[PDB]
Amino acid sequence: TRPANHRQLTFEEIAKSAKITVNEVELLVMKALSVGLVKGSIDEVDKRVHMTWVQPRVLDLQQIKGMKDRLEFWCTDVKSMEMLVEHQAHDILT
Amino acid sequence: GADREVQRILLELLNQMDGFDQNVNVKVIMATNRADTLDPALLRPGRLDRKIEFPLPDRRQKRLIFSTIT
Amino acid sequence: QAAELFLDTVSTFTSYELMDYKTFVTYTVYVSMIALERPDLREKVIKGAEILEVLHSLPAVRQYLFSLYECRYSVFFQSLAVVEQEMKKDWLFAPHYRYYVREMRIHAYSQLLESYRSLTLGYMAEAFGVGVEFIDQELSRFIAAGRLHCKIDKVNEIVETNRPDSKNWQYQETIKKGDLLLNRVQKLSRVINM
Amino acid sequence: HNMSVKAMRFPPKSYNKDLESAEERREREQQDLEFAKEM
Amino acid sequence: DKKFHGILDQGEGVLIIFDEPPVDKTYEAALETIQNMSKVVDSLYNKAKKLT
Amino acid sequence: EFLHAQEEVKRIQSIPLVIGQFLEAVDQNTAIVGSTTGSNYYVRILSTIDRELLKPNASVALHKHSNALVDVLPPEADSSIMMLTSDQKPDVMYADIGGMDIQKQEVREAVELPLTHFELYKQIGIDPPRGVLMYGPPG
Amino acid sequence: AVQKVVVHPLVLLSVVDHFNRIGKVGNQKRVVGVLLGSWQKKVLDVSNSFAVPFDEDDKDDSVWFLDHDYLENMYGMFKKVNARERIVGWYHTGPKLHKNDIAINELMKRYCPNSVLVIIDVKPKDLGLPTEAYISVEEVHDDGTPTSKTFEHVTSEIGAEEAEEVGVEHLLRDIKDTTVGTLSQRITNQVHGLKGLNSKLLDIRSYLEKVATGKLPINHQIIYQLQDVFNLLPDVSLQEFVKAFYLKTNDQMVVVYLASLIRSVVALHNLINNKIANRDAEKKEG
Amino acid sequence: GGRRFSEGTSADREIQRTLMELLNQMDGFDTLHRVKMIMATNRPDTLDPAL
Amino acid sequence: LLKLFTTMELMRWSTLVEDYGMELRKGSLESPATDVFGSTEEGEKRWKDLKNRVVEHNIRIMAKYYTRITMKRMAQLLDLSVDESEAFLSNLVVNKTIFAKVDRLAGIINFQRPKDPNNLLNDWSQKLNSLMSLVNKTTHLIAKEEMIHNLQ
Amino acid sequence: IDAFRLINANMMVLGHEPRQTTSNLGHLNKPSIQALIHGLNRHYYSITINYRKNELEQKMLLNLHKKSWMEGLTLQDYSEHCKHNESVVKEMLELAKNYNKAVEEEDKMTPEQLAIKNVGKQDPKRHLEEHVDVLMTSNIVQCLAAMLDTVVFK
Numbered sequence A: 001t002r003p004a005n006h007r008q009l010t011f012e013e014i015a016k017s018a019k020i021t022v023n024e025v026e027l028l029v030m031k032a033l034s035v036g037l038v039k040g041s042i043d044e045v046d047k048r049v050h051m052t053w054v055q056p057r058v059l060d061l062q063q064i065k066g067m068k069d070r071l072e073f074w075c076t077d078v079k080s081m082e083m084l085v086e087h088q089a090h091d092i093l094t
Numbered sequence B: 001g002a003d004r005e006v007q008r009i010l011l012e013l014l015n016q017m018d019g020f021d022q023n024v025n026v027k028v029i030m031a032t033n034r035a036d037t038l039d040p041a042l043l044r045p046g047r048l049d050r051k052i053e054f055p056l057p058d059r060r061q062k063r064l065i066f067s068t069i070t
Numbered sequence C: 001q002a003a004e005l006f007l008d009t010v011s012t013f014t015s016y017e018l019m020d021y022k023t024f025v026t027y028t029v030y031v032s033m034i035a036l037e038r039p040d041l042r043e044k045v046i047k048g049a050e051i052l053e054v055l056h057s058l059p060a061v062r063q064y065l066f067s068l069y070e071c072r073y074s075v076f077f078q079s080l081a082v083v084e085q086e087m088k089k090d091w092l093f094a095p096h097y098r099y100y101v102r103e104m105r106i107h108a109y110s111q112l113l114e115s116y117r118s119l120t121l122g123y124m125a126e127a128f129g130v131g132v133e134f135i136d137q138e139l140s141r142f143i144a145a146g147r148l149h150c151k152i153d154k155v156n157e158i159v160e161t162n163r164p165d166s167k168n169w170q171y172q173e174t175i176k177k178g179d180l181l182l183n184r185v186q187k188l189s190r191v192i193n194m
Numbered sequence D: 001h002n003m004s005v006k007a008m009r010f011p012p013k014s015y016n017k018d019l020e021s022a023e024e025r026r027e028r029e030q031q032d033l034e035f036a037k038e039m
Numbered sequence E: 001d002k003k004f005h006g007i008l009d010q011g012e013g014v015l016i017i018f019d020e021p022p023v024d025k026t027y028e029a030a031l032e033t034i035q036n037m038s039k040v041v042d043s044l045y046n047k048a049k050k051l052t
Numbered sequence F: 001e002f003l004h005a006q007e008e009v010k011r012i013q014s015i016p017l018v019i020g021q022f023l024e025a026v027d028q029n030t031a032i033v034g035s036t037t038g039s040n041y042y043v044r045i046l047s048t049i050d051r052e053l054l055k056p057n058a059s060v061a062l063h064k065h066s067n068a069l070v071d072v073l074p075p076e077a078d079s080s081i082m083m084l085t086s087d088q089k090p091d092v093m094y095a096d097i098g099g100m101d102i103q104k105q106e107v108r109e110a111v112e113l114p115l116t117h118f119e120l121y122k123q124i125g126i127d128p129p130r131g132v133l134m135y136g137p138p139g
Numbered sequence G: 001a002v003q004k005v006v007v008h009p010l011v012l013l014s015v016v017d018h019f020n021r022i023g024k025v026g027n028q029k030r031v032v033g034v035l036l037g038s039w040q041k042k043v044l045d046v047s048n049s050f051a052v053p054f055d056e057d058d059k060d061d062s063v064w065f066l067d068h069d070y071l072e073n074m075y076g077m078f079k080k081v082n083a084r085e086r087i088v089g090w091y092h093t094g095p096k097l098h099k100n101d102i103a104i105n106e107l108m109k110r111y112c113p114n115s116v117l118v119i120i121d122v123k124p125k126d127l128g129l130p131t132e133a134y135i136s137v138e139e140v141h142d143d144g145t146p147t148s149k150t151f152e153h154v155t156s157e158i159g160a161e162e163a164e165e166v167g168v169e170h171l172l173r174d175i176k177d178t179t180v181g182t183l184s185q186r187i188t189n190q191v192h193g194l195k196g197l198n199s200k201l202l203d204i205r206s207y208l209e210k211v212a213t214g215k216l217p218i219n220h221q222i223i224y225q226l227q228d229v230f231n232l233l234p235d236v237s238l239q240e241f242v243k244a245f246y247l248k249t250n251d252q253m254v255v256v257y258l259a260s261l262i263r264s265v266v267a268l269h270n271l272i273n274n275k276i277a278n279r280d281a282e283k284k285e286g
Numbered sequence H: 001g002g003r004r005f006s007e008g009t010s011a012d013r014e015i016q017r018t019l020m021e022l023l024n025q026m027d028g029f030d031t032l033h034r035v036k037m038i039m040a041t042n043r044p045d046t047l048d049p050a051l
Numbered sequence I: 001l002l003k004l005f006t007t008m009e010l011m012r013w014s015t016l017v018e019d020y021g022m023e024l025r026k027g028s029l030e031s032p033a034t035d036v037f038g039s040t041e042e043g044e045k046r047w048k049d050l051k052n053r054v055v056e057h058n059i060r061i062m063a064k065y066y067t068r069i070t071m072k073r074m075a076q077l078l079d080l081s082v083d084e085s086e087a088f089l090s091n092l093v094v095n096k097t098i099f100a101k102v103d104r105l106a107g108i109i110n111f112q113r114p115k116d117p118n119n120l121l122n123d124w125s126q127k128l129n130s131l132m133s134l135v136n137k138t139t140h141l142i143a144k145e146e147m148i149h150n151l152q
Numbered sequence J: 001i002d003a004f005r006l007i008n009a010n011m012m013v014l015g016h017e018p019r020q021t022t023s024n025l026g027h028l029n030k031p032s033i034q035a036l037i038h039g040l041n042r043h044y045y046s047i048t049i050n051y052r053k054n055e056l057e058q059k060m061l062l063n064l065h066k067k068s069w070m071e072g073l074t075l076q077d078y079s080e081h082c083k084h085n086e087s088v089v090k091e092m093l094e095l096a097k098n099y100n101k102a103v104e105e106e107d108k109m110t111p112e113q114l115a116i117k118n119v120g121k122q123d124p125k126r127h128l129e130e131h132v133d134v135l136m137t138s139n140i141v142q143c144l145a146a147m148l149d150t151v152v153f154k
């Protein structure tokens, strides 16, 4: 659910969404890393975890709209940056 | 001709010992039986300076060979 | 390069131009104390029997050298005025007696100051050399001169330090030499071909 | 660098003759190749 | 004596210890090239400035 | 166009390349060699050879008919290649030679000590020996 | 199992000349042939080939024929002239994956274990390499059919040979952007490279056409990788990643500044080498 | 075999070379194993002591 | 037993020895277990070498997954002194088999924290190469998925 | 290649020169002296040839021989690029000291002697501008290729 912006949750949030105490969530997430459904790191002193890779799930025809749109303006970045390459690199080779 | 060839053998090595410049570490070790049948022009300095005879041990280094072999 | 040409002090002889060999010893120690750091000083000039016994005849220079080595900071300025004043009167050091001790100051400052970080400013008067405002105006012209890598606090009365990685200071001399040689080749290029 | 390129191509001058080989030695080389073809 | 490096505190005696090998090989070994080349351009006076 | 002709000249190389040896050159880009056939020749070059890769004793390359310089060679010797170092030591130890304290240390002084500690002989400047002759009764 | 393939220009032209020699049929005929060669060190090799007689009718297109007598005799000739040369698979002319190319490979699997196919191009236009090879994998999986088999494309490239480069470079004579300096990579992979990313960008846009309108199977095995693309989308500009980027860039223009500083002095030495050719020549000759 | 010479005639030069090839080939830098040499003479007086 | 040292975090030592320090007398297997019990000095080396492996099996995966942990939390997961915890974390990093940078003013220790001048953009380039291989993976898989439904 | 064909040796006995040139098309390539040793003419003749190619073949071999894939969109061993960037500069210093050597014997013996005389030992001039090209092309490519991916990738 968390985007590629942060995806860094906290043990208080695990204690909120899973109603399980502070001294068990680390034993939970070490098991999640041992299974390998998730891949990230664990800070203990700031009570946050840097989740990086998650197990990929399935999705309906609504998520391909968002993946469609995030593909869409990623096209014109390649168009725009390559446009400088053919324009400024014009006379370098015919 | 068999002697002229050997003459040309000695001329080449006599040149190539002078083709050095003290910078390369190429050391020539030469071992013979009789020093009598040799040219002293081979034994000039710049080519040959160190001469090592192997004299016979008498008692002292002699017993060490007995220790090592026995 | 002067101390490096003065590296041996063994094959150097009872000369004609320094008829005292000990005068040559004083010259090579006066240039070496700037020229080399502690490792070289804690191996080279401290373990030489040929260098120790000739300044064994010297009361002043033995004390003037060892006071920096034994961290005898306050007495170092005393013989510093002596050796600097003699250097002012001396031939061939008279071009640079003014440049010598201002290197000796910033060397003796940086040696002590790169030990601590939280060392205050009113510590150096009684342990290092008297005059708090003298230390003030003397360090202000050195941090302000662009060396003596630290940052002094004033009204909480403490001297802070920092550490620069060799990424800016090693770069500064590169832009200096680049501007120098660019001035050189541009000047020559204006000279030749009219 | 470019000024050391552009203030540089005036001493190209008096490049009078790049003779290929010769005329007499070329005819003599053709005669020697003719002798090689006859032999 | 620079055999070990760090810092020393006087209020309580905390030794902040840190190390990284800095970039040394890159800048100076390209820097002495400059003072070679300045000697080359000074040698260009011995064939250019005196001559033409 | 000059890059096209730049590769074209090496057709003379091929396989049958004359195996001579460089001796000297009269001038720029024309030299004198001595073939492995026994005779000497006044030969031409090929231009792409770096001329600063010349003149030790490295064997040059010659065309078998037109007989000019083709290509420089890495060195070669058939004699005893290089003492192949694996099954080539005669596994005699220093301890196997008893009673040669003078000469064993003395040849170490002359042969492998300037080999390793070259700058001591350079710094004191005592002219380390070029070659060494050793002799005596057999056995 | 199979790393990659090696394709020569001799067989590459030696399919297209067959497309010329059966191009007189006009209507429709596909160049299907037997692919010969080796594979060593798990690197696939393609050296020689021929083409088998083949016809195909549009009604009931599940019928193929290869003259196996022609397959035996000419390949026995090829073994006799070249015992090193052997079978490596087959090929078809491959415009758009014709349907008999699921059981041609099963027809002649009894000769080569990895009886690999090669799709070629007869109308050459793209921004890449129109050379293709699949590999046969079969699957008894949970979904799909119980008997399920789908080809999988192993990567494809044009291997060279020191013999054939003389003839290839001889037959070009047209344009060749060699003298690889500061500009060859700029066009072979920087002008052309981002446009190489253009087509792979546009291919998932071509899969994207099934939002509510395209084909009936939806995702299953397409979207874990697509999720992994946006998941593995690289790091944003906040870290010392910025400062290390500035650091190493700022280190690189030291070297560029150095060599740039040397070059003008080099051409200045070349200038004095020309003024010496000016002033001590004009008085001498006149 | 010979003893040696002080190099009188021109013939015994290369014969001394032929003999000194033999002496080095006997026990010079080689594991002389399984190759047994049996010799014979009428006078062992004209022989090299190195032989 | 081998499952415990193949798998993830171990239940300290007291939560283990109450479950397995008793079957070493039971069953029909008690004799090399009595080579663990009966000798009390070799056996003591087995209680303390067993204690070494169970106190170490924490430390490996702690170094793996724990970016920065407090000293008291780890010493609580070792059920012993903070000083004995420092003796455990000294002789392993002078062994340098587990790298850590511990604290003794705030107790803020951490694992695998170098300066990294290079691995930021270096591992970033690794992410680039894996990204371009990943987008190369789907591309040749799409067109055959179209060919199995819209061929003829 | 030079495709040949027999000529009649009967006409050689006749002393009659064959083949009756009506076009300046055959006497364009000159025959070799080695085939002139043989019977190329006395018994055979040369033929001028060319080759038949078309755009159907030119594009499909031009666009396919030396083509990269995503190679220039990489970083080229990001720890070792700068390491190599010292691994050239370090001996480039001493080669610049040879450039601080060889200029100093100018205004001396004429440079044609400085052409023959330098065939045993290396020059700083050519070897110098070699590594300027090497260090330049090794750096600017990885520099620009490093900076496109910041724009393209997020």
Ligand SMILES: Nc1ncnc2c1ncn2[C@@H]1O[C@H](COP(=O)(O)OP(=O)(O)OP(=O)(O)O)[C@@H](O)[C@H]1O
Pocket (backbone or CB within 6 Å): B033, B065, B068, F096, F097, F098, F099, F137, F138, F139, H027, H028, H050
């Ligand atoms: N420590 C020793 N000192 C002298 N001789 C020894 C020693 N140990 C063994 N020997 C014997 O002396 C012989 C030395 O062999 P080597 O071939 O070196 O003799 P040499 O001096 O070269 O005489 P030649 O030139 O006739 O071979 C060996 O055969 C060995 O049996």
